[PDB]
Amino acid sequence: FRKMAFPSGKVEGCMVQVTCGTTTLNGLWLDDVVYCPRHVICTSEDMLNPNYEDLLIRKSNHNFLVQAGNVQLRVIGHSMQNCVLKLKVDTANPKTPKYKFVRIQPGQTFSVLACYNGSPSGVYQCAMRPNFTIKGSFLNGSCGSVGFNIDYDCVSFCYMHHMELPTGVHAGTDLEGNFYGPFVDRQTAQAAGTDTTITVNVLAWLYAAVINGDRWFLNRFTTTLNDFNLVAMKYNYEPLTQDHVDILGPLSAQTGIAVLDMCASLKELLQNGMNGRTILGSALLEDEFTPFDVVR
Amino acid sequence: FRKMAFPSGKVEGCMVQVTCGTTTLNGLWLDDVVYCPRHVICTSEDMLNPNYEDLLIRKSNHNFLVQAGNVQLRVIGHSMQNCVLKLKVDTANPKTPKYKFVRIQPGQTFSVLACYNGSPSGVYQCAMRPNFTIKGSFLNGSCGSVGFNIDYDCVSFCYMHHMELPTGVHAGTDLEGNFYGPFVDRQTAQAAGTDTTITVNVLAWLYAAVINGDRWFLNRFTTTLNDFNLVAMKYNYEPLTQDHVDILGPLSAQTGIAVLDMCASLKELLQNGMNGRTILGSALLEDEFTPFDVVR
Numbered sequence A, B: 001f002r003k004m005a006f007p008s009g010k011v012e013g014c015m016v017q018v019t020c021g022t023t024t025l026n027g028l029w030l031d032d033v034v035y036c037p038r039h040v041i042c043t044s045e046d047m048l049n050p051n052y053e054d055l056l057i058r059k060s061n062h063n064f065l066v067q068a069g070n071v072q073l074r075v076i077g078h079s080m081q082n083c084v085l086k087l088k089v090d091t092a093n094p095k096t097p098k099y100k101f102v103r104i105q106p107g108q109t110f111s112v113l114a115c116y117n118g119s120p121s122g123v124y125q126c127a128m129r130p131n132f133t134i135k136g137s138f139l140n141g142s143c144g145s146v147g148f149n150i151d152y153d154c155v156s157f158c159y160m161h162h163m164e165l166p167t168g169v170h171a172g173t174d175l176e177g178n179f180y181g182p183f184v185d186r187q188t189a190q191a192a193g194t195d196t197t198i199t200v201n202v203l204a205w206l207y208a209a210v211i212n213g214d215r216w217f218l219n220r221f222t223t224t225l226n227d228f229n230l231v232a233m234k235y236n237y238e239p240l241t242q243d244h245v246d247i248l249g250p251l252s253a254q255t256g257i258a259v260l261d262m263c264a265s266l267k268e269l270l271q272n273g274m275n276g277r278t279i280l281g282s283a284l285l286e287d288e289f290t291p292f293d294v295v296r
């Protein structure tokens, strides 16, 4: 069982480079608009406590340079929406896929196309953590890289990268410029809340282990949603809801293991440990596969 | 630190569907040739003891249905090269990237674009194991899916998927149709030899931990090369050769840690485990990043 990313071709054709002064980062070119982090309009100085409204009002179109490969795109208008800059350009991107902008919830997964200087470098799969950060791999120059899901030819864009927190995790916005998590686009140290484990995803991953012939952690027992949530709190696991249980029904139907029976399995792994044994080749309980991810 | 795949768009534009009789799998359309596994020509029986020369001479060009999306491609010739069938078609692929064919060695990494009926489904990064298998995720119609690296916009095709082994691992060929390892495109009692850890990759990843600000696993010991190998082989680690030591030279000079000093650390890590810690994001010693992967 491998973590898989979506094929990135539809998004690769949308990545451009945006430069404002000496600040450069990635942008998303869809039809005749380029989307990118508003903090591109900042110098290192403004970055400590910028006034974005003021910094933008004194910019004109000629302050933005947009490069799609070896072609300059002429900016003919500019606008801000929340923390995202919108540069209207000369030309419609002829490679624009069918797409929509969506906001995801913690525990959901998506693919990230990591880009540098407007050039796609790699793709990886990740999950939005309960504390709204991303455990990603982003270096300097990665801002404006996007996250996405694909459903039958339609790209659902859900994330644009803005910043790295001191603990090495990552923070960003949706494509309408709304931050995930209690973070602001400023050059300051900001700490994420204590992260927790995505319980419904661990259960999904145990179903995939059963589906793949690993059965040793199964037992005869059941637990209650109430008493599982008690052990959940103790080990910093997200509380399990009746909504989660209904989501795992298709895997409970497919394998004959009721969710609270699987919770009994998970309760014992949390206390007793793995006995040194292994599940899907993992020493830790994996929590970045959703139920949907497993059934596919 | 994430295991990143290469952006897959340049390969997505080459994936097609090949049907001969009742068997369908994936093909790779480059210029005016479609490459696919030769067992596309096998019927239900066939697979136990196929005589590919005799099965192929009975075929006409029109027995091969090739579909690139909704477009049917006209086959105008065919031949067999080792274990891959090469279908000459009417039309050069307009989306053909710069490419080459390479044969890789155990320990090398690459990306796989998993495909079903010629449509890309997911992309993941992996390594050729020392026993010449792949720990992949391949469902029923994934034969003909390919593995690749991308360097300076040139796609190096190194792997084509042919078989699944009873352990759940995968076997295939280079793009000249020669199998990796001792396997055959025949449904016999073949299993992979015992698998081992790629030692030079573990050491690269430890050097990557030092560069990302981790030093907790270092110690004050060194080791001779032979003593290191005598110990590591007791944990099913591949022997470390003088070539592997030379290869880690640049990472040694950068971090200031001599290669045999890192070997002493690895000996201690194998003896002790992690003691509830993680090195990058793993409670496991990771062996699917190369010295080349780490430098970037």
Ligand SMILES: COc1cccc2[nH]c(C(=O)N[C@@H](CC(C)C)C(=O)N[C@@H](C[C@@H]3CCNC3=O)C(=O)COP(=O)(O)O)cc12
Binding pocket: A023, A024, A025, A039, A047, A138, A139, A140, A141, A142, A143, A144, A162, A163, A164, A165, A166, A170, A184, A185, A186, A187, A188, A189, A190
């Ligand atoms: C006091 O300050 C701090 C203290 C402690 C931790 C801190 N972290 C950040 C931060 O993350 N700052 C944003 C910019 C602000 C305006 C939101 C940033 O730097 N984002 C990067 C990607 C980053 C770079 C490395 N890995 C990434 O993910 C871009 O891509 C654009 O910047 P570049 O033009 O590439 O340098 C500031 C800070």
